[PDB]
Amino acid sequence: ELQLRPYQMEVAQPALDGKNIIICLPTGSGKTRVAVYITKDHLDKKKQASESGKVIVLVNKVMLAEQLFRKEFNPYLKKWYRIIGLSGDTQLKISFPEVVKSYDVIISTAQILENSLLNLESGDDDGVQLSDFSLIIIDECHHTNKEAVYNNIMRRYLKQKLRNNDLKKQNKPAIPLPQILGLTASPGVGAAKKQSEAEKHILNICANLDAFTIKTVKENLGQLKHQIKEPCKKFVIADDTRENPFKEKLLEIMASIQTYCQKSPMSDFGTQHYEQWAIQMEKKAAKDGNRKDRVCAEHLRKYNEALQINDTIRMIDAYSHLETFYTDEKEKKFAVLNDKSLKLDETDEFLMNLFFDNKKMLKKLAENPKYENEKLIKLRNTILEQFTRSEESSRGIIFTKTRQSTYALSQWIMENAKFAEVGVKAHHLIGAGHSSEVKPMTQTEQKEVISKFRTGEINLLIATTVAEEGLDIKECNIVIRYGLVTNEIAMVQARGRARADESTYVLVTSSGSGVTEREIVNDFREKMMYKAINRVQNMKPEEYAHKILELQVQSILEKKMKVKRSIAKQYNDNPSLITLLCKNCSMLVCSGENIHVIEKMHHVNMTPEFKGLYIVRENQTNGEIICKCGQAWGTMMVHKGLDLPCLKIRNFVVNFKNNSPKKQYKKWVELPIRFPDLDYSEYCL
RNA sequence: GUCAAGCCGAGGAGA
RNA sequence: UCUCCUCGGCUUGAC
Ligand SMILES: Nc1ncnc2c1ncn2[C@@H]1O[C@H](COP(=O)(O)OP(=O)(O)O)[C@@H](O)[C@H]1O
Numbered sequence: 180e181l182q183l184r185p186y187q188m189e190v191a192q193p194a195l196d197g198k199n200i201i202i203c204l205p206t207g208s209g210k211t212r213v214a215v216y217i218t219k220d221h222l223d224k225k226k227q228a229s230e231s232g233k234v235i236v237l238v239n240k241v242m243l244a245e246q247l248f249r250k251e252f253n254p255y256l257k258k259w260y261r262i263i264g265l266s267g268d269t270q271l272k273i274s275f276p277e278v279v280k281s282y283d284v285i286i287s288t289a290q291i292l293e294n295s296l297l298n299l300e301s302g303d304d305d306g307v308q309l310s311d312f313s314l315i316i317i318d319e320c321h322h323t324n325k326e327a328v329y330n331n332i333m334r335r336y337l338k339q340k341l342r343n344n345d346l347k348k349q350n351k352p353a354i355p356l357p358q359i360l361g362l363t364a365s366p367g368v369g370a371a372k373k374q375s376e377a378e379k380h381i382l383n384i385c386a387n388l389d390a391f392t393i394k395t396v397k398e399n400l401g402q403l404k405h406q407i408k409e410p411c412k413k414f415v416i417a418d419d420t421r422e423n424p425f426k427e428k429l430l431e432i433m434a435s436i437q438t439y440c441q442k443s444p445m446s447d448f449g450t451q452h453y454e455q456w457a458i459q460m461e462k463k464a465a466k467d468g469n470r471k472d473r474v475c476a477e478h479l480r481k482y483n484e485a486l487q488i489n490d491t492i493r494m495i496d497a498y499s500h501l502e503t504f505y506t507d508e509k510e511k512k513f514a515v516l517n518d519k520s521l522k523l524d525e526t527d528e529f530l531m532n533l534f535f536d537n538k539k540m541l542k543k544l545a546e547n548p549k550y551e552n553e554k555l556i557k558l559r560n561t562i563l564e565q566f567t568r569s570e571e572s573s574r575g576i577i578f579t580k581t582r583q584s585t586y587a588l589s590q591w592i593m594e595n596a597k598f599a600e601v602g603v604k605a606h607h608l609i610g611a612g613h614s615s616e617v618k619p620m621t622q623t624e625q626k627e628v629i630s631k632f633r634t635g636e637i638n639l640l641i642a643t644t645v646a647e648e649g650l651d652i653k654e655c656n657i658v659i660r661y662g663l664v665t666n667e668i669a670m671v672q673a674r675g676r677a678r679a680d681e682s683t684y685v686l687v688t689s690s691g692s693g694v695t696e697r698e699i700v701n702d703f704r705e706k707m708m709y710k711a712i713n714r715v716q717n718m719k720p721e722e723y724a725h726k727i728l729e730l731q732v733q734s735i736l737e738k739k740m741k742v743k744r745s746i747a748k749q750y751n752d753n754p755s756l757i758t759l760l761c762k763n764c765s766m767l768v769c770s771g772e773n774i775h776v777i778e779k780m781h782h783v784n785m786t787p788e789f790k791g792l793y794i795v796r797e798n799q800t801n802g803e804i805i806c807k808c809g810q811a812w813g814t815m816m817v818h819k820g821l822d823l824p825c826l827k828i829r830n831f832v833v834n835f836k837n838n839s840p841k842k843q844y845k846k847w848v849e850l851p852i853r854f855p856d857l858d859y860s861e862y863c864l
Numbered sequence: 865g866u867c868a869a870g871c872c873g874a875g876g877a878g879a
Numbered sequence: 880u881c882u883c884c885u886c887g888g889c890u891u892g893a894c
């Protein structure tokens with residue numbers, strides 16, 4: 180039933196007899212289909228030889244497992260073989276190693292594999308080896324770089340390859356390694372300023388995958404072009420000539436707080452260097468115990484966030500953001516005040532009497548349809564133009580950086596009627612990150628959105644970086660780029676998603692940022708890498724071989740050194756040689772001896788002395804903890820009945836017993852000293 | 865069928 | 880060395 184194309188045949192041809200190789204063709208050229216044909220050929224070959232053989236497909240995401248368990252492998256190969264798709268959300272029943280030798284055609288998110296490998300290498304948890312396979316197939320090879328996921332697998336593969344080659348000249352017995360087929364669209368250039376460094380990068384990839392060719396289509400090209408096309412590029416620039424009543428109204432507050440602080444930014448309001456200045460200022464102030472300087476740092480950081488979204492989003496969203504923030508703040512203050520406690524503050528009183536007195540005003544200055552936003556009006560024009568031009572023949576995708584962005588966009592495009600009168604149904608899309616003010620999403624919710632859009636029930640999918648790679652849509656036209664430039668790969672992989680006729684690509688930039696600049700940079704890199712590929716394809720085989728062997732050895736030796744600096748590198752097993760203080764206030768909290776651990780992940784104290792100090796701010800089981808001063812400390816945790824209040828070290832501050840170089844660490848794993856697990860013998864009767 | 869929390873690794877961007 | 884964003888994975892719990 181599965182049908183082929185000609186160029187598919189010629190590009191596949193060498194892989195059909197050994198030849199572990201790489202492929203790169205433009206998006207939507209049957210890469211999956213040619214892979215599927217190679218699967219069928221491989222296994223039929225191994226059976227007609229009466230030999231054993233199995234296949235593992237690797238992706239770098241969680242949708243693609245079921246994407247390709249639904250649409251391309253399973254519908255064609257169900258008859259002759261069993262198939263199974265694995266991800267980070269499919270509740271298995273057996274384990275991974277057992278299904279290595281049960282279903283015979285697997286598909287996996289990557290890290291499942293490496294987990295099982297290092298389990299086989301560390302303990303007796305069953306695990307798996309590479310000799311338990313006959314073929315690895317890869318999608319989106321180009322992530323094979325410095326310390327990525329795929330790279331560890333290929334490091335182990337190359338190590339065993341060199342062992343095989345050392346046994347080539349020492350013994351007869353050697354292990355037959357599995358074949359490797361890599362697929363991509365752009366192997367991509369890793370930050371090279373020239374054509375030659377880019378060539379070197381291609382060779383680094385190819386040696387990190389044990390390649391022999393690339394096999395770009397050149398012969399059967401008319402077939403491609405009559406069958407495949409590209410969109411038309413389009414730039415959309417918009418400049419500001421407004422924002423003096425609102426934006427400057429906030430820069431006013433910034434100057435006011437700085438003149439309350441006596442601290443010079445020495446840079447511009449509304450950027451990242453200003454942020455970094457505030458961050459280091461805060462870290463030093465907490466390293467000094469100085470209040471009045473960390474706190475305006477944190478607030479000015481919030482104002483900078485508000486400005487940076489004001490570069491992208493209306494006044495109203497930032498008003499909402501800081502409304503949530505100071506709402507939480509006043510909640511903490513009232514919770515402290517409402518707990519045999521009488522005291523008042525001077526800083527926080529100043530900040531709040533500075534803000535809330537302008538809260539109503541800024542809400543009044545928020546709602547103004549005149550200067551809503553340049554880029555937003557521009558996309559209104561672009562969108563409505565397209566969705567009027569197509570007459571129900573639309574399928575939309577939108578990209579951006581953050582998620583709060585996406586939520587606001589979906590909300591507001593549900594609000595406005597010019598978008599609803601056309602009936603451009605909308606929904607956003609994100610990866611399962613349980614960290615935001617935003618409400619997170621679920622895997623099943625993601626898949627339902629995929630199905631509703633492929634159904635066409637949604638007309639525009641707002642998507643974060645989960646949606647550059649994959650999402651084999653049947654046919655869509657309109658894709659855009661809301662003020663985002665990362666590299667050449669995101670550009671090309673998004674610019675080729677309109678798998679349909681009369682496709683378009685768009686960028687939406689502000690003139691006050693080097694964005695279209697990097698647009699052109701990525702364009703040049705795209706032109707550059709094809710020339711580099713044409714160079715290496717015409718390379719001599721023996722010279723190619725020598726170079727890839729060099730780079731294999733370089734990758735393996737680099738691992739070893741990165742291992743040498745990580746043998747221990749910090750092994751002071753100093754249990755309680757510290758004191759943890761609060762960070763806002765310089766209030767002592769705990770020592771190291773009262774601390775214990777659960778699950779060898781979570782660090783906690785479980786003594787009444789730490790108990791009778793904090794407050795539980797209400798929304799109910801997982802409660803949030805706060806300080807007496809007003810600092811947030813941690814979250815509750817009900818572990819085996821024990822109501823242990825766990826915390827985050829990033830909120831607290833260090834003070835050693837020896838000489839007190841106060842520091843911040845941002846996470847537990849970084850620091851040297853060790854804490855023990857908690858024997859439950861305590862807290863009994 | 866629902867929800868919450870924390871931990872870790874990696875990439876990209878910027879400085 | 881720092882920051883931001885993003886992604887993938889792992890455990891605990893509650894309905
Ligand atoms: N042999 C074939 N004949 C016709 N169309 C094909 C064939 N093989 C694949 N396709 C088309 O290719 C599309 C899949 O492209 P795909 O390779 O998944 O994109 P990407 O390369 O970005 O992963 C499908 O929509 C399908 O219609």
Ligand SMILES: [Mg+2]
Nearest residue numbers: 210211318649
């Ligand atoms: Mg693909």
Ligand SMILES: [Zn+2]
Nearest residue numbers: 761764806808
């Ligand atoms: Zn405190």
